[PDB]
Design an enzyme around this catalytic site. Sequence first.
Site, short mmCIF file in Angstrom:
data_model
loop_
_atom_site.label_atom_id
_atom_site.label_comp_id
_atom_site.label_asym_id
_atom_site.label_seq_id
_atom_site.Cartn_x
_atom_site.Cartn_y
_atom_site.Cartn_z
N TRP A 136 -9.24 6.14 -0.84
CA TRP A 136 -9.62 6.92 -2.01
C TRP A 136 -8.63 6.49 -3.13
O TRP A 136 -7.66 5.81 -2.79
CB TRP A 136 -9.59 8.42 -1.82
CG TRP A 136 -8.37 8.98 -1.18
CD1 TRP A 136 -7.18 9.31 -1.81
CD2 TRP A 136 -8.17 9.29 0.20
NE1 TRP A 136 -6.29 9.80 -0.89
CE2 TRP A 136 -6.88 9.79 0.36
CE3 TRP A 136 -9.01 9.18 1.33
CZ2 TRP A 136 -6.35 10.20 1.58
CZ3 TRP A 136 -8.48 9.58 2.55
CH2 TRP A 136 -7.18 10.08 2.67
N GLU B 140 -4.50 4.24 -10.71
CA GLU B 140 -5.17 2.93 -10.62
C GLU B 140 -6.32 2.85 -11.61
O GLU B 140 -6.65 1.85 -12.26
CB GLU B 140 -5.56 2.75 -9.14
CG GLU B 140 -5.99 1.35 -8.76
CD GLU B 140 -4.87 0.33 -8.72
OE1 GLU B 140 -3.71 0.68 -9.01
OE2 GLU B 140 -5.19 -0.83 -8.38
N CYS C 215 0.79 -1.23 0.00
CA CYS C 215 0.00 0.00 0.00
C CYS C 215 0.82 1.27 0.00
O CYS C 215 1.59 1.50 0.93
CB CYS C 215 -0.91 0.01 1.24
SG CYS C 215 -1.98 1.48 1.26
C1 HEM Z 1 -6.21 6.43 1.77
C2 HEM Z 1 -5.86 6.10 0.51
C3 HEM Z 1 -5.27 4.96 -0.05
C4 HEM Z 1 -4.60 4.92 -1.25
C5 HEM Z 1 -4.43 6.12 -2.17
C6 HEM Z 1 -4.18 3.56 -1.42
C7 HEM Z 1 -3.45 3.13 -2.52
C8 HEM Z 1 -3.04 1.81 -2.71
C9 HEM Z 1 -2.47 1.32 -3.95
C10 HEM Z 1 -2.11 2.19 -5.20
C11 HEM Z 1 -2.39 -0.02 -3.84
C12 HEM Z 1 -1.46 -1.05 -4.80
C13 HEM Z 1 -2.51 -1.65 -5.64
C14 HEM Z 1 -3.24 -2.86 -5.08
O1 HEM Z 1 -2.61 -3.70 -4.37
O2 HEM Z 1 -4.45 -2.99 -5.34
C15 HEM Z 1 -2.89 -0.37 -2.52
C16 HEM Z 1 -2.95 -1.67 -2.05
C17 HEM Z 1 -3.40 -2.01 -0.77
N1 HEM Z 1 -3.91 -1.09 0.15
FE1 HEM Z 1 -3.99 0.89 0.03
N2 HEM Z 1 -4.54 2.76 -0.33
C18 HEM Z 1 -5.38 3.60 0.39
C19 HEM Z 1 -6.13 3.15 1.50
C20 HEM Z 1 -6.12 1.86 1.98
C21 HEM Z 1 -6.74 1.49 3.23
C22 HEM Z 1 -7.71 2.43 4.02
C23 HEM Z 1 -6.37 0.22 3.50
C24 HEM Z 1 -6.68 -0.62 4.58
C25 HEM Z 1 -7.25 -0.34 5.80
C26 HEM Z 1 -5.50 -0.20 2.42
C27 HEM Z 1 -4.97 -1.49 2.33
C28 HEM Z 1 -4.24 -1.91 1.21
C29 HEM Z 1 -3.98 -3.30 0.95
C30 HEM Z 1 -4.13 -4.53 1.89
C31 HEM Z 1 -3.45 -3.37 -0.30
C32 HEM Z 1 -2.97 -4.75 -1.01
C33 HEM Z 1 -4.11 -5.19 -1.96
C34 HEM Z 1 -3.85 -6.51 -2.65
O3 HEM Z 1 -2.97 -7.28 -2.22
O4 HEM Z 1 -4.57 -6.80 -3.65
N3 HEM Z 1 -5.31 0.84 1.54
N4 HEM Z 1 -3.26 0.77 -1.84
O1 LIG Z 2 -6.04 3.80 -4.78
N1 LIG Z 2 -5.79 2.64 -5.05
O2 LIG Z 2 -5.20 2.46 -6.06
C1 LIG Z 2 -6.07 1.62 -4.25
C2 LIG Z 2 -5.75 0.31 -4.59
C3 LIG Z 2 -6.11 -0.73 -3.76
C4 LIG Z 2 -6.80 -0.48 -2.56
C5 LIG Z 2 -7.23 0.83 -2.27
C6 LIG Z 2 -7.96 1.34 -1.20
BR1 LIG Z 2 -8.78 0.41 0.09
N2 LIG Z 2 -8.00 2.74 -1.42
N3 LIG Z 2 -7.31 2.98 -2.60
C7 LIG Z 2 -6.83 1.86 -3.07
#
Ligand code: HEM
Ligand SMILES: O=[N+]([O-])c1cccc2c(Br)n[nH]c12
Lengths: 414, 416
Positions: A290, A295, A118
């Site tokens: 958000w 993405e 993340c």
């Molecule tokens: C606040 C804004 C956030 C942004 C901009 C963001 C962005 C990202 C991005 C670009 C990815 C890599 C793409 C993916 O694995 O699907 C990702 C993955 C991840 N995010 Fe975040 N994230 C956010 C919030 C969250 C929150 C609130 C949580 C959890 C409480 C979270 C948990 C994770 C997890 C577990 C992954 C791995 C997903 C997978 O293995 O498929 N994210 N995030």
């Molecule tokens: O912004 N993202 O690209 C993105 C990817 C995967 C998980 C999340 C969550 Br929960 N917020 N944004 C995410």
Amino acid sequence: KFPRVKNWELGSITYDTLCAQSQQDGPCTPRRCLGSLVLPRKLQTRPSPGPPPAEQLLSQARDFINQYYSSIKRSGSQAHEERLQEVEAEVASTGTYHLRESELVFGAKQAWRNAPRCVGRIQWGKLQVFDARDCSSAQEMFTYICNHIKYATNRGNLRSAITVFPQRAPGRGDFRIWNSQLVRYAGYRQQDGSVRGDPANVEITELCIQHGWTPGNGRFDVLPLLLQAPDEAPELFVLPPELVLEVPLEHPTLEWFAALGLRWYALPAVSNMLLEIGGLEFSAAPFSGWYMSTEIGTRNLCDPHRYNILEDVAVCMDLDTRTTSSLWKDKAAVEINLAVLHSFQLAKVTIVDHHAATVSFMKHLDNEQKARGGCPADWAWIVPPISGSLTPVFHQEMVNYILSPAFRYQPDPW
Amino acid sequence: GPKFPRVKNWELGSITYDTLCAQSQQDGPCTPRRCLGSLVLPRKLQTRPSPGPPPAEQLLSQARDFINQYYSSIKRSGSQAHEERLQEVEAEVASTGTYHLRESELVFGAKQAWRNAPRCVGRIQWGKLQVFDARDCSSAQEMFTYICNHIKYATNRGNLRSAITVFPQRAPGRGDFRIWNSQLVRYAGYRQQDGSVRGDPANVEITELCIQHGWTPGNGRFDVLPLLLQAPDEAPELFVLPPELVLEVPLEHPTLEWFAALGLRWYALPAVSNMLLEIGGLEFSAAPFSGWYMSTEIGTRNLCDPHRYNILEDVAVCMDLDTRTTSSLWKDKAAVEINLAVLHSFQLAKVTIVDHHAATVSFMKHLDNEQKARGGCPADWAWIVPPISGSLTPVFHQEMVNYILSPAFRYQPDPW
Ligand code: HEM
Ligand SMILES: O=[N+]([O-])c1cccc2c(Br)n[nH]c12
Ligand code: HEM
Ligand SMILES: O=[N+]([O-])c1cccc2c(Br)n[nH]c12
Ligand SMILES: O=[N+]([O-])c1cccc2c(Br)n[nH]c12
Ligand SMILES: O=[N+]([O-])c1cccc2c(Br)n[nH]c12
Ligand SMILES: [Zn+2]
């Protein structure tokens, strides 16, 4: 054992000492690195064909309770000792235990903080945690989910949130959300193999139709939810349209872009992962934040196995799509990403571009180096899918490892 | 099922298993506990110069394996000729502590080192490498001649040809042949009094060593460095490449007329000169190799890395973009146009170049070829996926297994 970590842009070095707290194995060995593999088969989260070994469970539970008491600085306090004794009496008699709401809140925030893929983790402490462990039916699940979406969407001023449904229990079915995200667009296998909508969702679409959904025929039809209470068939629930905020896409200078009829939803809400806290497993615990603009603009609209729109936009752009060396893909991808940013900005919906997000992630790495001596990070997922070396994270070496509490993949319920 | 890593391609939904990694007999930096895959220089392949020969048994184990690979490659494993070669190699090690490769073995070895390089996207060319045997070299002056002939062969007036030149191996009780420069062609980096760098900031140290060793420095942005060449137990000697041997391409853009006025250029020939070539335990400390460029290496890494020429803002200002906010995507727009000028300019000059879309499509074919030929291909995803437009290319969507196979190109400590 401790890795020396270099930033090649700035020349700075740090040492990751947090990785020695990892208790769970990833898939790499000294003879071959499997860091680019998306899913596990060892990291997953195997059903419960009986409760885990109690010595294994209480080992994870005591470490989690110790993490929590350290977190509020009452380590060694009487409360700390009394809590450890409660959890142990519970696992000794029942093979399992239960978390206090305050422990659950800390755990879910730590799971996010620990998520190596993340890039948005600078936000990790600002997470709204909804306790839904008082839930005994799919209809109740749906109510909690609607309330989540309403909270998190907030008319476009998005707020990070998670809803936690009851934990897994040995010798009983899981609570599950079958959908991979709370909001996704249908994928309809149109006659000839080709797909109308999102090719990623053909199978879940088919399950929805087989469970009584009347399908639409559009490119952007919001899917119904398939929710399952233990040992029951999943139930179908249509989201009330007013709950699903969408952004139509337009470009700030190319007039025709809006005519492509593209749109995306505002709320990214992952719903099929498992949340593990202290050896307890929450099989239904949807979380949302958000979007990072790439993405939507790059992966979801331009991946070849997704909406695949590059060539359409390049033709509208009058580019030479006849040879690779015109860089027609690259030019069209940039304008698509710009359209996403402009459009969300216009609609007054939270979005973050990949330069701003990676700049903040570097700040997060520095914060974490100070707080815990390191930060688990998966380079391939942290570096954006366009403009990689134009961002600061590309030039930053990273160390990947699994810390608990954790978000994990799990088998599809069907 | 199969007791090997399962590898998925997410664009096509196809699966393969890598069985080739089971032949790896040299460990990487990862553990089940943590992945170090993104570290650039892992202390593994790397080689802290062993004052004397290898352990006779260590060297013999590596030699036997290599000779076995050689006889398998020509389809004579278990043969009379194969047994005799293992005996001869054993006897030579017993009497001298080292051994020597036959010419055909060196050629096989050098091509195999390239085939084996996990970070190289250009490996579909691996079978077409020209191996120049320079194992008779005995002076720095002679090294310079060999290098000028390599450069002329390899450049070929812009129709580039892959090549490697192999200088004598490391030997018991004798200093090493070394090229001090990290590429045969590099631009100088000159430290300014105000602390800036004029030219290529990656090359300040080698530039100051050239000066310390007698070179008279220029002060331009694209001054070709001289070579510092070292023969056994001698100080490095300095040689200036004749300019007519160094082909360069002035950069212009196909529609943006002002781009040519920036005065940017790049050299045609990428020729890595400071890696160690390891074959059957033998170490070729000087063995420069060259191919042709992938356009992102020039356009994105060399010109736009923040610690390199760092030209993004300048070009963005010329394009009248808003450089005061991230969401204008000014970096992305400028980068695309700089890469287009590199491709256009090399194409106009008739100098071999490959764009990142074509290179990664051919690498996907190389992976399919190697799945059949060897059961897998060691590949380092972070280095194979291009530094711009990563998920626009097929390799992004391909999972990869990274591991060390020998013969190999390895990093080695700097000679000073
Ligand atoms: C606040 C804004 C956030 C942004 C901009 C963001 C962005 C990202 C991005 C670009 C990815 C890599 C793409 C993916 O694995 O699907 C990702 C993955 C991840 N995010 Fe975040 N994230 C956010 C919030 C969250 C929150 C609130 C949580 C959890 C409480 C979270 C948990 C994770 C997890 C577990 C992954 C791995 C997903 C997978 O293995 O498929 N994210 N995030
Ligand atoms: O912004 N993202 O690209 C993105 C990817 C995967 C998980 C999340 C969550 Br929960 N917020 N944004 C995410
Ligand atoms: C024919 C054209 C070729 C192209 C387009 C090409 C392209 C690339 C690229 C883009 C890289 C990644 C950047 C890097 O690791 O430095 C690379 C790495 C490498 N290539 Fe190739 N390559 C070519 C030929 C060669 C040849 C002829 C050899 C050797 C016989 C070679 C050996 C390697 C090695 C050892 C690396 C790793 C360098 C390092 O770790 O610093 N390549 N190549
Ligand atoms: O600098 N880095 O940390 C880093 C990690 C992974 C790949 C690359 C490349 Br290609 N240049 N720098 C890299
Ligand atoms: O094109 N390249 O980007 C590139 C990178 C590193 C080494 C080589 C060689 Br040798 N030919 N091309 C290369
Ligand atoms: O498809 N892949 O093989 C693959 C490997 C590493 C990272 C990613 C991401 Br982010 N999408 N696909 C990836
Ligand atoms: Zn690894």
